[PDB]
Design a protein around this nucleic acid. Structure first.
Ligand SMILES: [Mg+2]
Ligand SMILES: [Mg+2]
Ligand SMILES: [Mg+2]
Ligand SMILES: [Mg+2]
Ligand SMILES: [Mg+2]
Ligand SMILES: [Mg+2]
Ligand SMILES: [Mg+2]
Ligand SMILES: [Mg+2]
Ligand SMILES: [Mg+2]
Ligand SMILES: [Mg+2]
Ligand SMILES: [Mg+2]
Ligand SMILES: [Mg+2]
Ligand SMILES: [Mg+2]
Ligand SMILES: [Mg+2]
Ligand SMILES: [Mg+2]
Ligand SMILES: [Mg+2]
Ligand SMILES: [Mg+2]
Ligand SMILES: [Mg+2]
Ligand SMILES: [Mg+2]
Ligand SMILES: [Mg+2]
Ligand SMILES: [Mg+2]
Ligand SMILES: [Mg+2]
Ligand SMILES: [Mg+2]
Ligand SMILES: [Mg+2]
Ligand SMILES: [Mg+2]
Ligand SMILES: [Mg+2]
Ligand SMILES: [Mg+2]
Ligand SMILES: [Mg+2]
Ligand SMILES: [Mg+2]
Ligand SMILES: [Mg+2]
Ligand SMILES: [Mg+2]
Ligand SMILES: [Mg+2]
Ligand SMILES: [Mg+2]
Ligand SMILES: [Mg+2]
Ligand SMILES: [Mg+2]
Ligand SMILES: [Mg+2]
Ligand SMILES: [Mg+2]
Ligand SMILES: [Mg+2]
Ligand SMILES: [Mg+2]
Ligand SMILES: [Mg+2]
Ligand SMILES: [Mg+2]
Ligand SMILES: [Mg+2]
Ligand SMILES: [Mg+2]
Ligand SMILES: [Mg+2]
Ligand SMILES: [Mg+2]
Ligand SMILES: [Mg+2]
Ligand SMILES: [Mg+2]
Ligand SMILES: [Mg+2]
Ligand SMILES: [Mg+2]
Ligand SMILES: [Mg+2]
Ligand SMILES: [Mg+2]
Ligand SMILES: [Mg+2]
Ligand SMILES: [Mg+2]
Ligand SMILES: [Mg+2]
Ligand SMILES: [Mg+2]
Ligand SMILES: [Mg+2]
Ligand SMILES: [Mg+2]
Ligand SMILES: [Mg+2]
Ligand SMILES: [Mg+2]
Ligand SMILES: [Mg+2]
Ligand SMILES: [Mg+2]
Ligand SMILES: [Mg+2]
Ligand SMILES: [Mg+2]
Ligand SMILES: [Mg+2]
Ligand SMILES: [Mg+2]
Ligand SMILES: [Mg+2]
Ligand SMILES: [Mg+2]
Ligand SMILES: [Mg+2]
Ligand SMILES: [Mg+2]
Ligand SMILES: [Mg+2]
Ligand SMILES: [Mg+2]
Ligand SMILES: [Mg+2]
Ligand SMILES: [Mg+2]
Ligand SMILES: [Mg+2]
Ligand SMILES: [Mg+2]
Ligand SMILES: [Mg+2]
Ligand SMILES: [Mg+2]
Ligand SMILES: [Mg+2]
Ligand SMILES: [Mg+2]
Ligand SMILES: [Mg+2]
Ligand SMILES: [Mg+2]
Ligand SMILES: [Mg+2]
Ligand SMILES: [Mg+2]
Ligand SMILES: [Mg+2]
Ligand SMILES: [Mg+2]
Ligand SMILES: [Mg+2]
Ligand SMILES: [Mg+2]
Ligand SMILES: [Mg+2]
Ligand SMILES: [Mg+2]
Ligand SMILES: [Mg+2]
Ligand SMILES: [Mg+2]
Ligand SMILES: [Mg+2]
Ligand SMILES: [Mg+2]
Ligand SMILES: [Mg+2]
Ligand SMILES: [Mg+2]
Ligand SMILES: [Mg+2]
Ligand SMILES: [Mg+2]
Ligand SMILES: [Mg+2]
Ligand SMILES: [Mg+2]
Ligand SMILES: [Mg+2]
Ligand SMILES: [Mg+2]
Ligand SMILES: [Mg+2]
Ligand SMILES: [Mg+2]
Ligand SMILES: [Mg+2]
Ligand SMILES: [Mg+2]
Ligand SMILES: [Mg+2]
Ligand SMILES: [Mg+2]
Ligand SMILES: [Mg+2]
Ligand SMILES: [Mg+2]
Ligand SMILES: [Mg+2]
Ligand SMILES: [Mg+2]
Ligand SMILES: [Mg+2]
Ligand SMILES: [Mg+2]
Ligand SMILES: [Mg+2]
Ligand SMILES: [Mg+2]
Ligand SMILES: [Mg+2]
Ligand SMILES: [Mg+2]
Ligand SMILES: [Mg+2]
Ligand SMILES: [Mg+2]
Ligand SMILES: [Mg+2]
Ligand SMILES: [Mg+2]
Ligand SMILES: [Mg+2]
Ligand SMILES: [Mg+2]
Ligand SMILES: [Mg+2]
Ligand SMILES: [Mg+2]
Ligand SMILES: [Mg+2]
Ligand SMILES: [Mg+2]
Ligand SMILES: [Mg+2]
Ligand SMILES: [Mg+2]
Ligand SMILES: [Mg+2]
Ligand SMILES: [Mg+2]
Ligand SMILES: [Mg+2]
Ligand SMILES: [Mg+2]
Ligand SMILES: [Mg+2]
Ligand SMILES: [Mg+2]
Ligand SMILES: [Mg+2]
Ligand SMILES: [Mg+2]
Ligand SMILES: [Mg+2]
Ligand SMILES: [Mg+2]
Ligand SMILES: [Mg+2]
Ligand SMILES: [Mg+2]
Ligand SMILES: [Mg+2]
Ligand SMILES: [Mg+2]
Ligand SMILES: [Mg+2]
Ligand SMILES: [Mg+2]
Ligand SMILES: [Mg+2]
Ligand SMILES: [Mg+2]
Ligand SMILES: [Mg+2]
Ligand SMILES: [Mg+2]
Ligand SMILES: [Mg+2]
Ligand SMILES: [Mg+2]
Ligand SMILES: [Mg+2]
Ligand SMILES: [Mg+2]
Ligand SMILES: [Mg+2]
Ligand SMILES: [Mg+2]
Ligand SMILES: [Mg+2]
Ligand SMILES: [Mg+2]
Ligand SMILES: [Mg+2]
Ligand SMILES: [Mg+2]
Ligand SMILES: [Mg+2]
Ligand SMILES: [Mg+2]
Ligand SMILES: [Mg+2]
Ligand SMILES: [Mg+2]
Ligand SMILES: [Mg+2]
Ligand SMILES: [Mg+2]
Ligand SMILES: [Mg+2]
Ligand SMILES: [Mg+2]
Ligand SMILES: [Mg+2]
Ligand SMILES: [Mg+2]
Ligand SMILES: [Mg+2]
Ligand SMILES: [Mg+2]
Ligand SMILES: [Mg+2]
Ligand SMILES: [Mg+2]
Ligand SMILES: [Mg+2]
Ligand SMILES: [Mg+2]
Ligand SMILES: [Mg+2]
Ligand SMILES: [Mg+2]
Ligand SMILES: [Mg+2]
Ligand SMILES: [Mg+2]
Ligand SMILES: [Mg+2]
Ligand SMILES: [Mg+2]
Ligand SMILES: [Mg+2]
Ligand SMILES: [Mg+2]
Ligand SMILES: [Mg+2]
Ligand SMILES: [Mg+2]
Ligand SMILES: [Mg+2]
Ligand SMILES: [Mg+2]
Ligand SMILES: [Mg+2]
Ligand SMILES: [Mg+2]
Ligand SMILES: [Mg+2]
Ligand SMILES: [Mg+2]
Ligand SMILES: [Mg+2]
Ligand SMILES: [Mg+2]
Ligand SMILES: [Mg+2]
Ligand SMILES: [Mg+2]
Ligand SMILES: [Mg+2]
Ligand SMILES: [Mg+2]
Ligand SMILES: [Mg+2]
Ligand SMILES: [Mg+2]
Ligand SMILES: [Mg+2]
Ligand SMILES: [Mg+2]
Ligand SMILES: [Mg+2]
Ligand SMILES: [Mg+2]
Ligand SMILES: [Mg+2]
Ligand SMILES: [Mg+2]
Ligand SMILES: [Mg+2]
Ligand SMILES: [Mg+2]
Ligand SMILES: [Zn+2]
Lengths: 138, 99, 151, 122, 208
RNA sequence: AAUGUAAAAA
RNA sequence: GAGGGUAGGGCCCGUGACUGGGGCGAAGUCGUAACAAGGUAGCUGUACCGGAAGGUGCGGCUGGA
RNA sequence: CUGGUCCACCCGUGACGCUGAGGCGCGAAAGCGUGGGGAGCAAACCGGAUUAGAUACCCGGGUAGUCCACGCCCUAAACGAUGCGCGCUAGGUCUCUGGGUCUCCUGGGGGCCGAAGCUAACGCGUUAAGCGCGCCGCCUGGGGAGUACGGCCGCAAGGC
RNA sequence: GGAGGAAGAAGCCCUUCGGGGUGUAAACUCCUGAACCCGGGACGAAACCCCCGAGGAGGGGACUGACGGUACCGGGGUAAUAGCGCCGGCCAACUCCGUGCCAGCAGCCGCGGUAAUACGGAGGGCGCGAGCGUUACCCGGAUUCACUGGGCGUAAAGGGCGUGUAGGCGGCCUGGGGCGUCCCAUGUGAAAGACCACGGCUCAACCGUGGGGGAGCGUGGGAUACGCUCAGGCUAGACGG
RNA sequence: CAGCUAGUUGGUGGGGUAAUGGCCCACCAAGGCGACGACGGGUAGCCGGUCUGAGAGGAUGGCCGGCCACAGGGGCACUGA
């Protein structure tokens, strides 16, 4: 039945990055888009694009990574080190603009839904709106 | 203002009177989650025009009786047993609690 | 050549017919009080030899640390299996406020303002290892945009 | 647990409990000595301690330690109770107070007289 | 009351010169000069590795004996600076240095902070004219501190001011030995002060 | 093919 | 109608000959069940039984080979 | 007579889903009731032997029970000591079962070794103890104790 | 009390019997002058009241101070109370004698059974000082009830197993409503208090004035992405042939 | 502590009151409340605030200010805005 399509997507990306895939797909959905769109615009992913598995709308999400490392375990540093859903289905989180979180002292982002649209933490303050704190990413 | 609420008549087994059940959601004071609670008000129906299942607005009002301090404002929709069931099954399962 | 400071020198032991002999733990930190830092844990049947040995390992394993006026860039939480440690940025005049271990680290790190706490376990050793990693995961604004670029 | 489980059952409060029924949780309680006696210590030590069973204002009847060297308590000494157990002695949750009522101070103590009710030597 | 009991025994406990004496501490014996090691029966014995506490402790105890001031008062001031916006560490010093009895010393009116206290206390000093016998009096920037009338002609005041010729002092201060007065020009920058101590270590001490 | 109390580790 | 009186129940506390087990106690009597195939692998639900640990039966588990 | 489950076709419904306090049903063995049955085995019980003793291990004997019907009891190392549902995250090999022209593939099951990762370690690892969300159950120092009081259930033993 | 004040009195403790310590500490020297003393001596009090102006507006006049001869100012003026906790580890502070599982200590770990930095006294030291310690209780540490911020194979913890009521949670597309939610506007959120600034009493505590924000609820307006909700469509879930 | 309830829930009319009201009364109808914790027991005046705490939280209500309650225990009404 799949509980939270969002947490899923976020997770799909986390599970994929760790193994360094080039792109994991995800079941398509308008609201899901924005998350990517922003997530990409800020520089967390090379990009995304609609696709189709055996007659099912999905989304390719081309992952970004750091350069190779020297020494034991040439594991390439991540571009997404951290990603986590805040407002869950079993606990909706809502914040006023006068109280929106600063992810990793500004290094990080905090995407969130709002009456004006899905916006970054900063863009939230920009247009001065609060909303459902979706998740943060750094 | 005379704050108005909205709920379904769950009882009409009374003269010129009806019982109205209304829920109200809200964020929990410590864990956020949008819990919901309800309450029964006794509404003054002078015509006995509002039967069971009717969803209705009811207004804060002059005392009518010990518990009647709300009048029936207007109809909202008729067929609504689905709700009446909820509250009635609730009463049911009480049988299966005592000892 | 840098600075030198040991966190502890414990005497471990081992059984063997007829008695017990002991090696000697010795954890030491070393730094220039200016970004370059390195931790070391030496062992040997001699206290001096042990600290000496920790000295060699210290300068071996090292780590540059992005210092913003004596504080750390962003806050980070790092759990070394057992224990866990928090690290927070603070304005000048705050001082290094932490358990004796992470102090040695951050002090010889050249850090001078920082809020911190040891949650979870607290074994000096593991908290040591933990902090090193934590700093080793600090990233300057550049590092960020530099990775988040990929031009 | 889930959040919801919390929203139901919820978090049980610690609720601690006392170590001294000096009653009214007062700072001290008066009483009369019922019996002045000397008792052997516990598991790892030994040395007959100076103790007395006191009847409380609070209708009780507790055993209490007489600190210091030598004392003057007898089967009718009124005295002040202080509370503080003793690792060495089985069930003894109170100290007597030297230097109040019929309980003298420690004779000739020069160091830390405050804890042994002893006046300042000239 | 202040520390009354022996002074030159602390010059000796901290191991750093403590200038809470007169001519003597500059003489060839701050007491410390003849014995560079702690008081008591031991003093010259194999010194032990100090606990982080011991170290942090010494530092604060050092800084306090310097200004010669009640622990209570000392702490409160620390807190007072912790409140206000500003580099807590240095600011603390600023409040310390801002005390009247301090000013008087810095300004050469007296040879000793302790002595200076007795001068303020016995009312020989005056701020902006109205006499002030309060050592703790926080001298704000722009106050004219000087010697009072019946006071001006006193031996001690004389000799001190006499010897106060030339010898420049404190960028945040300005003397006038002619008229026996000076000015708290401004609040002293950290650098102006040159204490043998370290504010940070004290900051730390007060986390415990 | 039973059992050996009770004061030893900077 | 305060309150008194009468009768009958409910909860809670204190107290009681004696009695059940429990905790603690540098040393006692009995044996040695367990910890190594602990010298019959142990452990377990249960049932009988025996000064005491226990034993045995049925099944079950390896935290046994 | 009947329950579950798996595979092929992509034909029908159209979010009808997931979890689940209480409730209800099932629930090894031993045990209880009434009636039956009884070969072998075997608590208790007796005799032999061993031993300081031996109510035990070993041997000879031996009743309830073990078997059936109907009813009751409801506990366990009821153990993978791991609640269920869904999505995601390298492969290697063994085996049970289905579909496909097939040294191969595709599904559902049972095992071992292992990516990444998790773990206090042992270890786990697409049958997760990894990464995530939903829902329930449970924990919060050792002893006293699964004891006591109360309540409920039970013929009883006794259970919750 | 302030400055000076010996290669450093006596006394006392330690010692490898040379010496080391208390220690600039004292004495002593000069200076200053709490207390005490004499003279002065408040603010807090202008109004009600009376005169003119009408008895009003406005102007004008006078009476009353409990604290108190106190605060404070002026002059004179004597070197003028120091105590308590601790010094095994946490925990800053070490030696000596006495003692001998005794006398005793104790917050945790533990310490004392002839040689104790752990008992008790001494010398010395660390900490604070008109205080210092103790007992009692609250919050802290305790992310040890965990919302922030924990867990459950073996450490304490998955229910014996299933069916299922209530509740909780709910896939993809579009539309209306706008409950939740976000925004703005206004009402309210007394004073006192908290924080900031500046002023008053010699400082300070205490006090005055001014400033700011505040969760929360009431009214109005607005946004509609996520949640909800009515409505419409789909087939990836689930079910069915 | 798991069920509670006869002025009990509602109505009609009536008393009473500054006034609404089972507040009290006559008749009528059978209702009202409860796992979202009724009914029962134990405790307690409540807030502005105070204390601690990184905070979220916890604890707490002395003095000052606000409201409530009482005036040896209990009941009653009289005068009156
Ligand atoms: Mg790659
Ligand atoms: Mg960009
Ligand atoms: Mg009707
Ligand atoms: Mg709200
Ligand atoms: Mg009952
Ligand atoms: Mg160098
Ligand atoms: Mg260098
Ligand atoms: Mg060195
Ligand atoms: Mg290594
Ligand atoms: Mg080497
Ligand atoms: Mg670099
Ligand atoms: Mg760097
Ligand atoms: Mg962990
Ligand atoms: Mg520990
Ligand atoms: Mg430990
Ligand atoms: Mg780096
Ligand atoms: Mg770098
Ligand atoms: Mg004994
Ligand atoms: Mg005696
Ligand atoms: Mg006697
Ligand atoms: Mg005497
Ligand atoms: Mg003592
Ligand atoms: Mg601060
Ligand atoms: Mg502050
Ligand atoms: Mg700052
Ligand atoms: Mg500051
Ligand atoms: Mg100058
Ligand atoms: Mg603090
Ligand atoms: Mg024996
Ligand atoms: Mg024996
Ligand atoms: Mg033994
Ligand atoms: Mg009566
Ligand atoms: Mg009666
Ligand atoms: Mg009576
Ligand atoms: Mg009769
Ligand atoms: Mg009775
Ligand atoms: Mg009784
Ligand atoms: Mg008994
Ligand atoms: Mg028993
Ligand atoms: Mg017994
Ligand atoms: Mg008994
Ligand atoms: Mg027992
Ligand atoms: Mg015994
Ligand atoms: Mg005997
Ligand atoms: Mg025995
Ligand atoms: Mg024996
Ligand atoms: Mg045995
Ligand atoms: Mg045997
Ligand atoms: Mg065995
Ligand atoms: Mg058995
Ligand atoms: Mg017998
Ligand atoms: Mg068996
Ligand atoms: Mg089985
Ligand atoms: Mg085993
Ligand atoms: Mg074998
Ligand atoms: Mg079949
Ligand atoms: Mg067809
Ligand atoms: Mg269709
Ligand atoms: Mg739906
Ligand atoms: Mg059964
Ligand atoms: Mg059977
Ligand atoms: Mg039987
Ligand atoms: Mg039978
Ligand atoms: Mg029978
Ligand atoms: Mg019969
Ligand atoms: Mg039979
Ligand atoms: Mg037979
Ligand atoms: Mg046989
Ligand atoms: Mg037998
Ligand atoms: Mg036999
Ligand atoms: Mg014989
Ligand atoms: Mg025999
Ligand atoms: Mg046999
Ligand atoms: Mg048969
Ligand atoms: Mg048959
Ligand atoms: Mg039959
Ligand atoms: Mg379950
Ligand atoms: Mg199912
Ligand atoms: Mg096949
Ligand atoms: Mg094919
Ligand atoms: Mg083919
Ligand atoms: Mg096919
Ligand atoms: Mg073939
Ligand atoms: Mg093959
Ligand atoms: Mg293949
Ligand atoms: Mg196959
Ligand atoms: Mg398989
Ligand atoms: Mg397979
Ligand atoms: Mg494996
Ligand atoms: Mg690996
Ligand atoms: Mg799979
Ligand atoms: Mg899969
Ligand atoms: Mg596999
Ligand atoms: Mg799975
Ligand atoms: Mg795991
Ligand atoms: Mg695990
Ligand atoms: Mg417990
Ligand atoms: Mg306990
Ligand atoms: Mg317990
Ligand atoms: Mg138990
Ligand atoms: Mg227990
Ligand atoms: Mg049992
Ligand atoms: Mg029982
Ligand atoms: Mg009971
Ligand atoms: Mg009882
Ligand atoms: Mg019972
Ligand atoms: Mg019965
Ligand atoms: Mg029977
Ligand atoms: Mg059970
Ligand atoms: Mg002097
Ligand atoms: Mg000397
Ligand atoms: Mg000498
Ligand atoms: Mg002279
Ligand atoms: Mg003179
Ligand atoms: Mg006097
Ligand atoms: Mg006058
Ligand atoms: Mg006047
Ligand atoms: Mg006046
Ligand atoms: Mg006047
Ligand atoms: Mg008059
Ligand atoms: Mg006139
Ligand atoms: Mg006139
Ligand atoms: Mg006039
Ligand atoms: Mg006038
Ligand atoms: Mg006038
Ligand atoms: Mg007077
Ligand atoms: Mg006077
Ligand atoms: Mg006079
Ligand atoms: Mg006069
Ligand atoms: Mg006078
Ligand atoms: Mg006077
Ligand atoms: Mg005058
Ligand atoms: Mg005067
Ligand atoms: Mg004078
Ligand atoms: Mg004198
Ligand atoms: Mg003198
Ligand atoms: Mg102390
Ligand atoms: Mg301390
Ligand atoms: Mg020390
Ligand atoms: Mg003796
Ligand atoms: Mg002797
Ligand atoms: Mg000795
Ligand atoms: Mg000894
Ligand atoms: Mg001690
Ligand atoms: Mg001692
Ligand atoms: Mg002394
Ligand atoms: Mg004072
Ligand atoms: Mg606490
Ligand atoms: Mg606590
Ligand atoms: Mg807490
Ligand atoms: Mg835990
Ligand atoms: Mg789990
Ligand atoms: Mg327990
Ligand atoms: Mg289940
Ligand atoms: Mg179940
Ligand atoms: Mg179990
Ligand atoms: Mg059960
Ligand atoms: Mg189910
Ligand atoms: Mg449902
Ligand atoms: Mg939805
Ligand atoms: Mg729903
Ligand atoms: Mg929906
Ligand atoms: Mg919609
Ligand atoms: Mg609406
Ligand atoms: Mg607003
Ligand atoms: Mg407020
Ligand atoms: Mg407002
Ligand atoms: Mg306002
Ligand atoms: Mg206010
Ligand atoms: Mg506060
Ligand atoms: Mg102003
Ligand atoms: Mg001022
Ligand atoms: Mg004055
Ligand atoms: Mg104000
Ligand atoms: Mg204000
Ligand atoms: Mg506020
Ligand atoms: Mg506001
Ligand atoms: Mg609201
Ligand atoms: Mg819409
Ligand atoms: Mg429809
Ligand atoms: Mg639909
Ligand atoms: Mg399908
Ligand atoms: Mg009736
Ligand atoms: Mg009426
Ligand atoms: Mg009236
Ligand atoms: Mg009534
Ligand atoms: Mg009526
Ligand atoms: Mg009636
Ligand atoms: Mg109640
Ligand atoms: Mg309270
Ligand atoms: Mg408030
Ligand atoms: Mg409050
Ligand atoms: Mg509050
Ligand atoms: Mg605070
Ligand atoms: Mg609070
Ligand atoms: Mg708390
Ligand atoms: Mg009050
Ligand atoms: Mg109170
Ligand atoms: Mg009072
Ligand atoms: Mg009063
Ligand atoms: Mg009072
Ligand atoms: Mg009040
Ligand atoms: Mg009100
Ligand atoms: Mg009364
Ligand atoms: Mg009365
Ligand atoms: Mg009275
Ligand atoms: Mg009366
Ligand atoms: Zn000196």
């Amino acid at each position: 039945m799949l509980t939270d399509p969002i947490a899923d997507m976020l997770t799909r990306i986390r599970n994929a990055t760790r193994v360094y895939k080039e792109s994991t797909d995800v079941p398509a959905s308008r609201f899901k888009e924005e998350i990517l769109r922003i997530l990409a615009r800020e520089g967390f992913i090379k990009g995304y694009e609609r696709v189709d598995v055996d007659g099912k709308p999905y989304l390719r999400v081309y992952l970004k990574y750091g350069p190779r490392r020297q020494g034991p375990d040439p594991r390439p540093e991540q571009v997404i080190h951290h990603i986590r859903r805040i407002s869950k289905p079993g606990r909706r989180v809502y914040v006023g603009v006068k109280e929106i979180p600063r992810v990793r002292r500004g290094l990080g982002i905090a995407i969130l839904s709002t009456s004006k649209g899905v916006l970054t933490d900063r863009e939230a303050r920009k247009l001065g709106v609060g909303g459902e704190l979706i998740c943060e990413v750094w | 203002p005379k704050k108005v609420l909205t709920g379904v008549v769950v009882s009409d087994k009374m003269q010129k009177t009806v019982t109205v059940l209304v829920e109200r959601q809200f964020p929990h004071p410590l864990y956020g989650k949008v819990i919901k609670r309800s309450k029964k008000y006794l509404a003054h129906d002078p015509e006995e025009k509002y039967k069971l299942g009717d969803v209705v607005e009811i207004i804060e009002s002059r005392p009518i009786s010990k518990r009647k301090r709300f009048r029936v404002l207007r109809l909202v929709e008729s067929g609504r047993m689905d709700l009446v069931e909820k509250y009635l099954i609730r009463r049911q399962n009480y049988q299966s609690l005592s000892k | 050549d840098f600075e030198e400071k040991m966190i502890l020198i414990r005497r471990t032991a081992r059984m063997q017919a007829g008695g017990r002999r002991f090696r000697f733990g010795a954890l030491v930190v070393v730094g220039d009080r200016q970004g370059r830092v390195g931790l070391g844990f030496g062992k040997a049947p001699e206290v001096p030899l042990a600290v000496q040995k920790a000295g060699y390992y210290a300068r071996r394993n090292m780590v540059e640390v992005p210092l913003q006026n004596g504080t750390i860039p962003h806050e980070i939480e790092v759990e070394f299996g057992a224990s866990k440690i928090v690290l927070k940025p603070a304005a000048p005049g705050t001082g290094v406020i932490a358990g004796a271990v992470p102090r040695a680290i951050l002090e010889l790190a050249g850090v001078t303002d920082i809020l911190t706490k040891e949650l979870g376990s607290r074994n000096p050793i593991n908290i040591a290892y933990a902090t090193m990693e934590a700093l080793r995961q600090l990233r300057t604004k550049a590092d960020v945009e530099r990775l988040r670029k990929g031009e | 647990p889930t959040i919801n489980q919390l929203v139901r059952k919820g978090r049980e409060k610690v609720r601690k409990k006392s170590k001294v029924p000096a009653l009214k949780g007062a700072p001290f309680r008066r009483g009369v000595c019922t019996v002045v006696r000397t008792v052997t210590p516990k598991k790892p030590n030994s040395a007959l301690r100076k103790v007395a069973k006191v009847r409380l204002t609070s209708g009780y009847e507790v055993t209490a330690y007489i600190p210091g060297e030598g004392h003057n308590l007898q089967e009718h000494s009124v005295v002040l109770i202080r509370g503080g157990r003793v690792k060495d002695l089985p069930g003894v949750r109170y100290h007597i107070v030297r230097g109040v009522y019929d309980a003298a101070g420690v004779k000739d103590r020069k160091k830390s007289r405050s804890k042994y009710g002893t006046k300042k030597p000239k | 009351g202040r520390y009354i009991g022996p002074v030159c025994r602390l010059c000796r406990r901290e191991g750093v010169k403590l200038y809470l004496k007169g001519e003597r501490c500059y003489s060839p014996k701050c007491a410390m000069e003849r014995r560079p090691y702690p008081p008591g029966q031991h003093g010259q014995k194999r010194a032990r590795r100090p606990s982080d506490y011991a170290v942090r402790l010494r530092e604060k105890q050092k800084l306090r004996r310097i200004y010669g001031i009640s622990e209570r008062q000392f702490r409160n001031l620390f807190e007072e600076a912790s409140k206000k916006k500003g580099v807590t560490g240095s600011v603390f010093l600023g409040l310390l240095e801002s005390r009247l009895d301090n000013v008087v010393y810095r300004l050469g009116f007296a040879v000793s902070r302790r002595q200076a206290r007795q001068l303020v206390r016995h009312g020989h000093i005056t701020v902006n004219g109205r006499r002030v016998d309060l050592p703790s009096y926080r001298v704000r920037p722009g106050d004219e501190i000087a010697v009072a009338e019946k006071s001006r002609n006193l031996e001690l005041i004389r000799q001190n001011l006499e010897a106060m010729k030339g010898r420049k002092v404190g960028p945040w201060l300005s003397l006038d030995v002619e008229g026996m007065k000076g000015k708290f020009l401004r609040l002293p920058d950290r650098e102006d002060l040159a204490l043998p101590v370290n504010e940070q270590l004290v900051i730390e001490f007060y986390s415990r």
